Structures are given as C-alpha cells and as structure tokens.
RNA sequence: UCGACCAGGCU
DNA sequence: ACTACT
DNA sequence: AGTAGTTATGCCGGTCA
C-alpha cells in the first residue's frame, strides 16, 4: 500500500529510504534494527514507520488492467 | 539425533504443517 | 405503548457525545450544523423585530 | 432514562465540529462515558415550554437529589485525580503561574492573595489558590481518623470563610458526598452559585494538572523485590493450611459443622483459606507501593480503581469460581482432562495463583474465564429483569 | 505595626512524615517551660535539623490588600529574619489550668503555640506573619 | 480502540507545537487517560507498549503470544539496554510553555484500531418533515430524515 | 462536516482586530486585551516579558478554549504607568533580543564547516 | 471474515449460556457476544 | 501429541521427534512430510470430546515430562508434571483460542472479560478485507490508508494472514492529563 | 555579541544541534514552536488529475504529492495567492509542475518525486524543486504501476504553513533540553529504589556542572541554556529554519507594536 | 407519498 | 426461561 | 393439570403485494 511520504509523529522524510531499506536486507544481508539506522531512522516514531509498513500495493498490482 | 525430543518452540512447526495442511476454514469445505 | 404512551417527534437531535472540561455546568456544545437545522417560532414584537428582520 | 436527571436541561452554545458537548460532572447524572455514547436533544417550542425547562428542569437545580437527600454531580477524573495533588502540604506554586491560575477563576476579584511564603521565595500553596474558587462563608469541617484541628497527616478537613485551613482534598470532600463541599455550597448559597463553582473549581484544577501532568504503566503495577517473595509465601502457606484440611478430611477426622455436610463444611474452610490469603497477599502489596505510585495516587483521591483492582494486578488474582462453588469437574472427577480424578487442591478448582503482571498459565486461564463468561452472563439477565421492574 | 510575640526555641526534633518539601517541627522554649511549639516548614528554602536555636516571632504587618511584587528593593521589611509565612489563627484552645494554646495555617503548612502572656497579645485576627533567624 | 476492549472517541485534535514532548523531540499520535487503566485491569495493554517500543528500536517483531517465558522484567532489560528508561516513563515538556512535566509519562507505540462508526453519519437532526401514513406520525431512521 | 477551515486559525476573520484592549473593572488600573488569530507562541512570551517591567503589577494570559485561535492577555501597572505601554516595552523588548540572536546565531554559523 | 466462518449457533438462562470444561480446547473461551445470545453463540 | 511411554531408553515420552519435526521444517523451506504424515504414522492424533475423558495430558511437552533434581522470580508459577500416566501432550496450549482472540497481545495478562470485548470489537475495526477489493462491487466497503502490521503479535497470527492483512497501525501513545480533553 | 547567546555544538546539512544560552525559557519555547509551525513553505495544494489508472485512488495520490518536499528557498518573494490580484493563481503566486507516467517496461514502472516537471516560469528563483536527498537521485515513490497504466497530473504549489496543513511545515522534529541534572526541581523522577540509578543520564548532562549533595536547593535558580536541535525535511535549509523562525515570531511581535499604532488614532 | 415481516450489528 | 392464575 | 402472559432503551441487509 506504497510506502508513506513522511512519518506520522514528526513529519521527517522517508518515501525515498523504502527501496534503499528493502536492499539492505535482501542484497547486503543486514537485520532490520541496522538497516534502519543505516538509513538515518533514529527514534522510533521514524522507525516504526518503515519496519511496519506492508507494501500491499504489490499484490495490488498483480492484478491487470 | 533425529530420534531426541521436542521443546517448545518446536510445536510451532507442527501447529504450521496443521495449516498447511487443513487450513482455516477446513470444517465448512470437508 | 408505542404511539401513544411515547412517540417519535420532530425538533430533535442526535449524535455522538464527547466531554469538554470548558463548559459551564450547565450549557451543553452544540454541533452548528444542528443548531441551523432545529429551530424556534419566535413572535414579531416591537422588542425583536430589529433582531428578527437581520435573521431573515 | 432512569431517573429525573436523565433528561435536565442545558444552556446552548452553537460550536464547531460535530458532538454534543457536556461539563464533565454532569456526566454521572446521564451515565455517559465517551466510548461513543449518544445523546439525544429536543428544543422546547412555547415560550412557556421552555420557561418549564428553564425553572424546573436546568442543571443547576437537579445538583442535589431527592432521590438519597444528596448532591448528584461531583468532581471527576482529572479534576478530582489533580484536586488532590494540588491540595499536598508539599505543593507550592511562584508567582508567574499563580497570576495564570488567578486569571484563570472568571470570577477572580483581582487581589492576589497573599503569599502563605514570603521568606526568600515568595510562594502560595496549592489550598491557597484552589480557595479563590471557594466563595465567601463557606464553612466546612470533617476529621477523618488521626484528624486533629492540627492533623498530622493532612487528614480530615477545616474551611473557614471560604478558604482551605488543613486537609487534602480528595474525593470524600468534592465529590457527590453527603456533607459535600458541594452539597453545602449549593444549600447555603444557591443553585447558581454552586453550578459555577464546578465551574471554576475545574478551570483551576485542569490547569494546574495541564502542567504538573500525570500518568501510569507497568512500572505502577510491579510490587517490590522481596515484598513480591514475601507474598509467594503467604500464599504457599496458605496452599498447605489447605493441603492439611484436605488430608485431615480423607482420614475422616472432621466436625461436621450442624447443618453442613463434611463436604460442605470441607470446602467453606477451603475457599475461606485462598481468599483470607489473596487479600493479605494483596494488603501486602498495597502497602509497598509508594506515594509516589500513580496507580495508588488514584485511589487516594477517589478518582479511579480500589483495594482488589491493586491486588489482583501486582499480587494474586485469586479463586475463580461459578454459582458459588469454586470451578466443577465438569470432567468425570476433575476440572480439565490435565488433571488426575479426585483432585480437590487449589491448582485446580480454579485458585489464580498468579497476578496479571506475571500472567495466568492454561489452566487459571481457562478458568477465569469460565468465571468471567458467568459474569457476562448474568449482567445481561440482570438488565432485562432490572428493566422490567423499573417499569 | 507592632510585634505580639517573642522568643528563642530549640528544635526537640523535625520530621517529614511521607514529605519531601515539608517536616513538622518541635521546639521548647529557652524561658518559660510552658511555651512549646509545633511547626510545618519548607524545609527547602530553610532546612532544620534538630537541636537549633530559631528566632520565633509574629504581629500583624511588617512596618494588607492586593499583593505586590518585590519593588521593594527599598522599601520598608520587617523581613530581618530568614523565613517569613503568613497564614491565619483558627483555634485558641484552652489547655486547662491557665495554658492557652492557639492554631495557626499558613495555607496549608500549620502551627500549635502555648505558654500565657499574649493575653492582650495574641489576636485572633487573620493577620500574623511568622518569622524566623538563625 | 486497542486491542484490549479499551474503546474511546477522539475529543479534540492538537498540532505539534501543542502536544507535549520528549526531549528527543518525539511527540504522540494519541494521549489516552491513565483513568482508564486503574479499574479496567487491562495489564496487557502496558505491555503491549513496553514490548512494541523495544520492537521499534530493536526492529526485532515483538512476541506478545499467550503463554510464552516473557515478562516485563526481561523487556525492561532491553529497553534499558536502548538508553530509555526502563518502565517506559519519560521525561516530557509541556507544549505551550516549554517547561518540563513534574511527572514522567508512560509512551511509547501500541497498535490502534480505528473502528466503523464515525460520527459524520451519525450526527442526525430534525424539526419537522416526513410523517408517517396510517400513524401521521414522524417517519422513522436518520436515513429517512425521521425524528 | 462542522470543522472550520484551517485558515481560520491565522487569518483576521472580516473585521476583527488582532487587539481589542478592554479596562477591567475589577482593579485600578489594569486591563484585558484580547489577541484575535493568536496562540501560545504570543501569548506566553508576551507574558513572561511583561513579567520583567517591575512596574508591572500582575499579567497572566489565559486560552478561553482550544477551539479558538485567540487569547485574552490581562495587564495591571503601578499608577501613572500606563499598561498599553508596558505591552509596547515588553514587545520591543522581545524583538530586540531576538534580533541580538538572530545575528549571534549567524556568527557561530558562518563560523561552521560541513 | 475468519471469525465469521468458524461460528457457531445455539437454538434455545443459565446452564447453556456458560463456559464448560468439556469446551476446553474445542470452542474459544473469550470469543462470545454479550447480552443476549451470549454464550449462545460460540466460536470454533 | 501422543506420549506413549515406548522408551526402552528412560520414562514415558512424546512420539513424535526432533528429526520428525526437523523433517517438517525441510519441506516448509521448499516453498513431502505433511501433516497426514505425523497422523498416519502415528506421532499425533484426533481427541473428540467424549475420548478426551479417558486420558491424561500435559502442557508444555518439556517441563511435564523430565525428572526433578534456582527459578526465574520474574516468571508466573506453574504447577508440575505430577504424573507418569501422561497419554497425550497439548500442541501448545495457545490454540483452546479462537480466530478472533488470537490477536489480542498478552491475554494472559487482562482480566477475562476485556478479552471477549476485543475479541467482537476487532470485528467493527477497518483494514484490507481482500487485496482485490479495487475489484469488487460490495455494497459498502472500508479499506485502511495505510495499513501496518502490528509491532507486537502473536504466532497465531501467522496463520491467520495478520501481518499481511493488518487491521490499524502502530501509533505513538502517551498516557496522559493533558487538556483535561 | 549582545543579547541572548548560541554556541553551534555539532551542525550538518540537516541537523544543526546547538546551545541556546542566556534566554528565556518562554522564548527558547516560543522559537521551537514557531520553527514547527508558522514558517512559510511551497508544497503542492491542487492536482488536476486528467488520467489514472493505477491501484491507488486519485485523492489517495494527490494526498502524497502533498507531503512531497519542494524548494522553497526563495518562497519569500512568492506571494499567498490569497493576496495576489489574479483570479486564482499565477506566476506570481504558484509554481506549476507536471506528472506523466506509463507502464512501457513488463516491470513495475516507478513515479518518482525526481519525475515531477515545473511549467510555470520560475521568474528565476529557488522555488518548486522535487527536492532530492536520494541516493539515486529520486526521491519519495510517488506510486507504482504495471502494464497499460497511465498516470496524468498536474499540481499547483502554493505558499502555506504548518497551521493550515502540516505539508506546509519545513521543521519536522525538534530536540529540547534543560537542566539535565534536575537542579531547578522541574520534575520530581518516579522509582523503585532510585531515581538515579534507573533513570539514564543525558548526553548533555557533561555540559554543565553536576549537583554536589552538600549544597542547600538553590531556588532563585531560573533557567538558561537550552540544548536543540534542528533537524530539517529539506525544503529550507537547517540554518534557515532557525533564522526564519527567530525572524517569523519577531515579526509577528512587531504586528502587534503595529497593531497597539493604528489603535491610537482612536 | 410510502409499509410489512425476518434476520443481523451497536449502547 | 420464568411465573402466576383458572 | 391447562392456560396464558412477559421478557431494557434507542439506533443502524433482504423478500412480499
Ligand atoms: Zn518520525
Ligand atoms: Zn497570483
């Protein structure tokens, strides 16, 4: 359900960190709580925001026309 | 050792080959 | 019992309640959009018809 | 609509956004609470309908009720959890927020008090301000236990003229109490007056707790290190002075009680051993947690939870039970089928050994909630009959 | 614009009962053995700790209405001494024989007098500001 | 609502400069009452927090299933082990005036439903309008526009 | 549905003022202005400022009710000093130490690497 | 849409209503409507 | 699980094995050994109400089972394996559950009844019923902005498509007298 | 140099931590809330949406572009459309950008904020600009799409601030501290056995001097010394979000010395 | 103009 | 599911 | 025995002539 422009809590950017995020876990084979701070996350309110996000929009474009 | 026992965190395992297998709504199919 | 003991009216309102520790006791917040739909049949006097007439 | 105040009538206030909007004391009048309650709202159409309203029915009047010769609305939740606080000996506030508290009284004559500490700070109490909002000739006195025109602890209470001489004030003195700060305020000076008095009263209170703020988590819920061992005692013992009975029961050396069977009379010593446990494992808690324990600050002022909600969280939730007994065998001669027949001890009629901060196992589990679901039950058979009787 | 009371007590000892801003205090008077006293007091803008000599005084002004800030920078201040409170009097009990004792709240923090020579001195009155030095 | 029969409606809205905040600038989505707490014995609900706040930090999923080897002792390890206080309490500043909250309070993240049921339909009114036929009396349903 | 435009939080709605000085009856020389389309951010600064005039008597502010973008400011001086002019000093005050700290911040910026 | 299909009726104060032991394992202990059919209605 | 005493190598234990399961997680990463496998063989089997009578179980398939030869202050308090009888062995106790509980976080740490609230409450919330509602002509329909899984969950979930699914998000909350509001 | 002094601790492109020294606490406060909310920013507030076909809903789309970050350097010299003299809008008052996406390649084709294209003469100004803090240089994803699916917008930036919408804010967190070793008694740390030991210390606890028991409690302590930090979403620069917020409030200071002026005629 | 019956959900 | 009356 | 009468308030899909 693409990711979110921007955290909830405090407004910081991070429409662009979800690429970025998702390689730093598949390619450089990085856990979650790293690959977060790799990408500048630093309290949770940013944080919880990508960890969570379930990028339904995928499933969504499965479908076809 | 394929013959030691089992703690807890193995009956997930099981408990997930259930699913796999039945699934959620088994009983109204059935 | 359900027509005459008690009945459905007109110039009534309903919806969700929510507390606000800045109300008098005794006065009640009500939602604008209610409060321009109930309405009250006030009678031209001399001492209204001023306000009355900016009403209409 | 129950009773009378059910229906009281309100002066309007045309606002933004889409709910009704209602002072949180005349909340427990209609019993209403935000989870999503509605309420409906009709508008006279006479000018002698609405005069009907205006002097019966308003708010104000309906403060005191016939229904138990007392006042019906009193001060609540955050009011009622912050009077307190700002009522503590401890309690003092300088200049800069006094004038907003001050301020904050509409009806404020513009003197400020004078401060109860000039010395090097000049600072006010909270008693001090908080008084501004208690008119003139207003005279209360209560003593609670160790009260004593000099209570050491703070305890009962003494207004003069207005105005906060000793104790705290908590719940038993502007709550919908008997000798009510309310109850007299409304008798002595009028419905009017006593209605803005809840007014005011909260404007200085809310305030003040606006800043000093106030909250709660586990960490209020969690019973210290050895006062927690202490009380896995209190209950082991009391687990053998029933383990005992029990044996001393299977050997047939037991007074059967005039009119109870053995087994009748076996268990009444039973459960009154688990409970008369649980309590004191609770009592023992209570008394570790701290003033500074949020949980317990709520209870002091009255505002929300008692003795067992702090027991039954930090010490032990106790024995569950159904139409009395404590949990069958539904079971050929047991409760569940992890048991072994004949089985009568605690661990399994359905004593929770456990508190809610360490977590039921799968059986005190299963258990309370056999207990739970007959509460459920009956609350929804209590209400059709209560309902029809009230007719 | 005068004094109603006058003397040097000893600290029997101080206690702060559950009060991390606030101990209860109790002292004997260094002249007449009848005058005792109990006093609360901010112990954290003037700390107390037990066997103490304190100046103990009352009257009513300081040479009331609205208060006003310091200003006073010059201004007159029978402040000479290191706490000054004010609060007011709501009890004069009679401690039987010719032993007067009378309450005083400074809204909040209280105090309990005794002895029997402020005959034309202790007022009842609302007015008293207490002080302290040493 | 949570996940613990803790329902409640929304009763004002405040923007950042208002809401109150942690020194590390962190601010809440929502402000629930402690009151609510006390009576309602909803012990999970705290941990629900405790535990999802670590999981954030940690970015490690957070186990809350029934009858594990948790407990709130171990957790408040870890988030100690993370710099913040190990109950969840924080220091926090009142909003409107900068200066800090005397007490410490509770936060941290807990999953939150937003349920069906949003006043915008609901909110009905009426003052005269569609009667009903054989009764002459008003019709019923906010649908209908009865009273 | 009933929410008012966000707008309406800074803009002067037609015809209103952002002052709106009243003489409060209560005490001697001491008033009540009222900050139409205002919040906290002038409110409390204005009040502590005021707070420093050692002429001033009493200033306190206080938001009637969230909803409203607007607060009232109460302001009471020593005699033969005028409150609206306490408000003024208060004011330059303010803005003259926000000016020094624009500047002094700029410094210690320019003064900076990365 | 999961719990829907794992739910049970119970055609008809009391015993019925109440949870039993024998439904250890077989029904869900907390999952009933209040009020009315409580109890009554029972998830798998 | 059956616990059939069958060990010539000590007491009475659960037939089914380490390899047994370490047999199972092998054919999850490859996506042989089904469920119907540790039936037909044997390892598990379906108690109905009336047989459930005549038997014996135990919890945690460990803990019930060793010898008895110091212990966690924080953990709860469990009882013990007081038995040797022991015929069968619970799965995993979590599973008496339901659908709908099975997402509540902790319910072992709430009175009983705020457990049945949650438990017809998560029926009113709004999530992603289906991912092919943009395709679907329901007569009303509510699909969340932005769905999130929940920080804390529940192994039950797992099965019950949760995470992927979600029902609400994971906001910052502060329990707190704030504006009286 | 004279008043209220700064002393920029660490400072970054996006961070700018710093001590505020020897000012209020009311305006220490007053600067943080302002940087959040009333600094005026360009963000997009209108998007004619001609065609899309994507999984995402059209208010769902124009939600995001919303958030977008855009430059706003010189958003001092574009004016609040709601005072420029055109019906509507113009140059003078908005910046104009365009989206155009099509699924040509089999897989997922990517919207990216870097795909936004302005129109609307810039009248040569740092105005509108998808700002870019990306590694690849695209970012925030706007949306994703598949096949045949086509995606034709148009927005309008305009000038705004927080009050009004949060996307309008330029802020987005901000650091306060004071008094690290409680020595103003501001708070009163709750506990089991102490507050010391189980409450962490801060990291600016070192600058400035701890306690010493001892010491009687000073009250006639104020409170000086703020330890912030500015973090920025990019459409204005760090240091300027501290500057134009200090300027910002400092206006609206003067607007009432102004207003107490045209109150005088009368 | 606009109804009945049934069933289901919220307080 | 409960309860009284002809 | 047989014989009837009740049962909380209020609000918000789907077949039938
Ligand atoms: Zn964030
Ligand atoms: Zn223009």
Not at chain 4, 53 to 73: F, R
Not at chain 10, 233 to 256: E, F, H, M, N, Y
């Amino acid at each position: 359900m693409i990711v979110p422009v921007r955290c909830f809590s405090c407004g910081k950017v991070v429409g662009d960190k979800w690429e970025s995020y998702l390689n730093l876990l598949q390619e450089d084979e990085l856990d979650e709580g790293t690959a977060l701070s790799r990408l500048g996350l630093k309290r949770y309110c940013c944080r919880r925001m990508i960890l969570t996000h379930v990028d339904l929009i995928e499933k969504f474009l499965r479908y076809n026309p | 050792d394929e013959s030691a026992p089992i703690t807890a965190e193995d009956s997930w395992a099981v408990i997930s080959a259930f699913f796999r297998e039945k699934g959620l709504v088994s009983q109204q199919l059935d | 019992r359900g027509n005459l003991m008690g009945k459905r009216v007109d110039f009534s309102a309903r919806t969700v309640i929510s507390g606000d520790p800045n109300l008098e006791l005794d006065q009640v917040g009500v939602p604008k959009s209610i409060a321009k739909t109930l309405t009250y049949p006030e009678v031209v006097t001399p001492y209204n018809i001023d306000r009355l007439t900016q009403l209409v | 609509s129950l009773h009378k105040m059910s229906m009281m009538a309100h002066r309007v206030k045309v606002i933004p956004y889409s709910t009704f909007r209602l002072n949180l004391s005349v909340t427990s009048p209609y019993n209403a609470d935000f989870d999503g309650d509605e309420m409906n709202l009709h508008v006279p159409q006479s000018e002698e309908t609405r005069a009907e309203l205006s002097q019966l029915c308003a708010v104000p009047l309906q403060i005191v009720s016939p229904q138990s010769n007392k006042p019906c609305m009193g001060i609540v939740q955050d009011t009622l959890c912050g009077i307190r606080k700002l009522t503590l000996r401890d309690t003092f506030i300088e200049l800069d927020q006094v004038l907003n508290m001050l301020y904050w009284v509409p009806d404020w004559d513009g003197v400020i008090p004078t401060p109860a500490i000039i010395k090097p700070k000049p600072l006010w109490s909270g008693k001090q301000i908080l008084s501004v909002a208690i008119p003139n000739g207003i005279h209360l006195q209560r003593f609670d236990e160790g009260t004593t025109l000099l209570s050491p602890k703070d305890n009962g209470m003494l207004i003069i003229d207005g105005q906060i001489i000793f104790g705290v004030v908590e719940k038993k003195t502007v709550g919908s109490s008997n000798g009510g700060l309310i109850h007299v305020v409304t008798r002595e000076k009028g419905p009017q007056v006593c209605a803005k008095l809840f007014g005011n009263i909260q404007k200085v209170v809310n305030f003040w707790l606006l800043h000093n703020g106030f909250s709660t988590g586990i960490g209020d819920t969690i019973a210290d290190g050895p006062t927690m061992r202490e009380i896995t005692e209190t209950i082991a013992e009391a687990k053998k002075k029933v383990l005992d009975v029990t044996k001393e029961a299977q050997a047939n050396l037991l007074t059967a009680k005039h009119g109870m069977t053995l087994r009748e009379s076996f268990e009444d010593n039973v459960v009154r051993f688990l409970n008369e446990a649980r309590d004191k494992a609770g009592r023992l808690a209570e008394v570790n947690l701290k003033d500074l324990n949020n949980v317990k600050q709520m209870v002091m002022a009255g505002s929300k939870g008692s003795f067992i909600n702090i027991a039954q969280m930090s010490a032990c939730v106790g024995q569950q039970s159904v139409e009395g007994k404590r949990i069958a065998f539904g079971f050929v001669d047991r409760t569940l089928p992890h048991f072994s027949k004949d089985d009568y001890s605690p661990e399994s009629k359905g004593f929770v050994e456990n508190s809610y901060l360490r977590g039921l196992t799968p059986q005190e589990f299963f258990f309370h909630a056999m207990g739970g679901r007959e509460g459920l039950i009956d609350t929804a058979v209590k209400t059709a009959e209560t309902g029809y009787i009230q007719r | 614009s005068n004094t109603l009371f006058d003397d040097i007590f000893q600290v029997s000892e101080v206690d702060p009962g559950r009060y991390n801003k606030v101990c209860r205090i109790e002292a004997a008077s260094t002249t007449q053995d009848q005058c005792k006293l109990t006093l609360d007091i901010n112990v954290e803008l003037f700390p107390v700790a037990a066997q103490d000599s304190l100046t103990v005084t009352i009257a009513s002004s300081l040479n009331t209405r609205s208060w006003r800030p310091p200003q006073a920078g010059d201004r007159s201040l029978a402040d000479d001494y290191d706490y000054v409170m004010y609060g007011t009097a709501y009890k004069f009990e009679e401690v039987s024989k010719d032993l007067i004792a009378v309450y005083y709240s400074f809204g909040g923090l209280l105090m309990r007098l005794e002895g029997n020579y402020r005959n034309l001195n202790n007022l009842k009155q609302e007015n008293a500001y207490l002080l302290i030095r040493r | 609502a949570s996940r613990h029969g803790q329902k409640g409606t929304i009763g004002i809205t405040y923007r950042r400069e208002d809401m109150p905040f942690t020194a590390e600038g962190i601010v809440p989505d929502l402000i629930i009452n402690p009151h609510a707490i006390p009576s309602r014995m909803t012990v999970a609900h705290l941990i629900e927090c405790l535990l999802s706040k670590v999981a954030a930090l940690s970015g490690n999923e957070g186990d809350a299933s029934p009858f594990t080897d948790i407990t709130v002792e171990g957790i408040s390890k870890l988030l100690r082990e993370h710099g913040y206080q190990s109950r969840g309490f924080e220091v926090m500043y009142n909003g409107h005036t900068g200066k800090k909250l005397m007490a410490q309070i509770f936060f941290g993240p807990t999953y939150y439903q937003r349920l069906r049921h949003m006043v915008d339909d609901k909110i009905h009114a009426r003052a005269r309008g569609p009667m009903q036929v054989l009764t002459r009396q008003p019709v019923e349903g906010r649908s209908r526009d009865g009273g | 549905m009933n929410a008012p435009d966000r707008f309406e939080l800074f803009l002067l709605g037609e015809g209103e003022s952002k002052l709106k000085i009243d003489p409060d009856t209560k005490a001697p020389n001491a008033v009540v202005i009222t900050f139409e389309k205002e919040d906290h951010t002038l409110g409390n600064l204005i009040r502590a400022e005021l707070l420093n005039d050692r002429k001033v008597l009493f200033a306190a502010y206080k938001v009637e009710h969230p909803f409203f973008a607007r607060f009232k400011l109460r302001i009471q001086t020593t005699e033969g000093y005028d409150p609206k002019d306490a408000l003024k000093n208060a004011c330059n005050s303010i803005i003259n130490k926000l000016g020094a700290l624009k500047t002094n911040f700029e410094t210690e910026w320019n003064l900076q690497t990365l | 849409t999961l719990s829907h299909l794992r739910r049970t009726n119970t055609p008809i104060l009391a015993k019925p209503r109440q949870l039993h032991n024998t439904h250890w394992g077989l029904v869900c202990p907390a999952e009933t409507p209040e009020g009315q059919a409580c109890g009554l209605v029972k998830n798998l | 699980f059956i616990v059939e005493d069958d060990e010539s190598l000590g007491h009475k234990e659960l037939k089914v094995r380490k390899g047994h399961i370490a047999k199972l997680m092998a054919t999850e990463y490859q996506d042989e050994y089904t469920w119907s496998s540790l039936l037909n063989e044997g390892l598990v089997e379906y108690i109905d109400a009336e047989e459930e009578e005549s038997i014996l179980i135990a919890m945690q398939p460990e803990d019930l089972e060793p010898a008895e030869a110091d212990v966690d202050p924080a953990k709860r308090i469990r009882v013990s394996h007081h038995a040797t009888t022991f015929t069968h062995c619970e799965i995993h106790p979590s599973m008496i559950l339901g659908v709908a509980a099975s997402i509540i976080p902790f319910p072992d740490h709430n009175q009983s009844p705020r457990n049945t609230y949650q438990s017809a409450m998560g029926k009113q919330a709004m999530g992603v019923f289906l991912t092919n509602y943009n395709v679907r002509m329901d007569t009303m329909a509510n699909i969340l902005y932005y769905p999130q899984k929940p920080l804390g969950t529940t192994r039950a979930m797992e099965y019950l498509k949760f995470r992927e699914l979600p029902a609400g998000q994971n906001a910052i909350v502060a329990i707190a007298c704030y504006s009286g509001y | 140099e004279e008043g209220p002094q700064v002393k920029i601790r660490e400072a970054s492109k996006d961070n700018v931590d710093f001590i505020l020294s020897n000012v209020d606490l009311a305006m220490a406060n007053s600067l943080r809330r302002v940087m959040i909310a009333e600094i005026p920013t360009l963000a997009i507030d209108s998007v004619e949406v001609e065609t899309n076909t994507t999984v995402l809903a059209d208010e769902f789309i124009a939600h995001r572009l919303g958030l977008i970050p855009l430059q706003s350097m010189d958003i001092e010299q574009l004016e609040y459309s709601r005072d420029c003299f055109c019906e509507d809008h113009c140059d003078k008052c908005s910046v104009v950008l365009t989206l155009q996406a099509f699924g040509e390649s089999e897989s997922t084709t990517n919207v990216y904020s870097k795909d936004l294209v302005i129109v609307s003469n810039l009248m040569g100004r740092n105005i509108g600009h998808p700002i870019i803090q990306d590694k690849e240089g695209n970012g925030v994803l706007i949306c994703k799409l598949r096949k045949g699916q086509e995606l034709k917008l148009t927005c309008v930036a305009k000038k705004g601030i927080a009050k009004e919408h949060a996307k309008w804010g330029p802020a987005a967190a901000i650091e306060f501290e004071y008094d690290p070793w409680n020595k103003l008694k501001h708070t009163d740390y709750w506990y089991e056995q102490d507050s010391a030991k189980e409450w962490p210390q801060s990291k600016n606890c070192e600058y400035e001097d701890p306690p010493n028991e001892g010491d009687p409690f000073d009250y006639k302590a104020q409170a000086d010394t703020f330890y912030m930090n500015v973090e920025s979403v990019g459409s204005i620069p760090v240091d300027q979000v501290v500057v134009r917020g200090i300027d910002t409030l400092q206006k609206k200071v003067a607007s009432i010395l102004l207003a107490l002026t045209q109150m005088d005629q009368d």
